[PDB]
Design a binder for this molecule. Structure first.
Ligand SMILES: CCS(=O)(=O)NCc1ccc2c(c1)OCO2
Ligand SMILES: CCS(=O)(=O)NCc1ccc2c(c1)OCO2
Ligand SMILES: CCS(=O)(=O)NCc1ccc2c(c1)OCO2
Ligand SMILES: [Zn+2]
Length: 139
């Protein structure tokens, strides 16, 4: 689990979005595994605006943050899960690291702020759904 809170927006994994997230839907992209809902309380997170390829992510299944090198956001095939069919996920970044399903929503951060959230894993890789292209999150 995990979300990003910026302005009046809550960013979550689309597959973990709650009934209240869907009741307050602003934007969703199935191909990206993202959903943004509206919040009443102001959020304090800053979104990174950069092309960093190094950062730190929170891994709940290890109660640890790991530093990682990650690929630029791209269209990658993701094996079917208990939340998705075997499909092509867009705006996805991969690193070598530990990820289990429950690690989804872990934040990946660089010096500029939030880069993305854990979205995929397995085979010793962790996949992060990029948010740095969603400029509207900061207006
Ligand atoms: C992540 C597990 S969950 O059960 O809390 N949310 C999934 C969900 C399923 C159907 C929905 C919905 C939300 O909102 C509209 O219809
Ligand atoms: C030295 C072994 S490693 O390279 O596999 N450690 C992970 C790592 C990845 C990116 C980093 C970093 C550490 O610190 C700065 O950026
Ligand atoms: C084959 C195992 S599975 O059917 O549960 N889905 C793959 C998976 C593994 C690790 C994850 C993940 C999804 O999302 C975050 O880290
Ligand atoms: Zn950065």
């Amino acid at each position: 689990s995990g979300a990003i809170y910026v302005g009046n927006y809550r960013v979550v994994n689309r597959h973990l979005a709650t009934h209240n997230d869907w009741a307050n839907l602003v934007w969703e992209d199935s191909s990206r595994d993202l959903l943004v809902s509206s919040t009443t309380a102001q959020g304090c997170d800053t979104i990174a605006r950069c092309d960093c390829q190094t950062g730190v992510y929170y891994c709940s299944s290890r109660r640890k943050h790991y530093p990682v090198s990650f690929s630029k956001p791209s269209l990658i095939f993701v094996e079917a899960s208990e939340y998705y069919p075997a499909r092509y996920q867009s705006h996805l970044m991969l690193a070598v690291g530990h990820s289990e399903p429950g690690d989804c929503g872990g934040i990946l951060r660089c010096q500029h702020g939030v880069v993305g959230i854990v979205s995929t894993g397995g085979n010793g890789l962790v996949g992060f759904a990029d948010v740095r292209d969603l400029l509207w999150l900061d207006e």
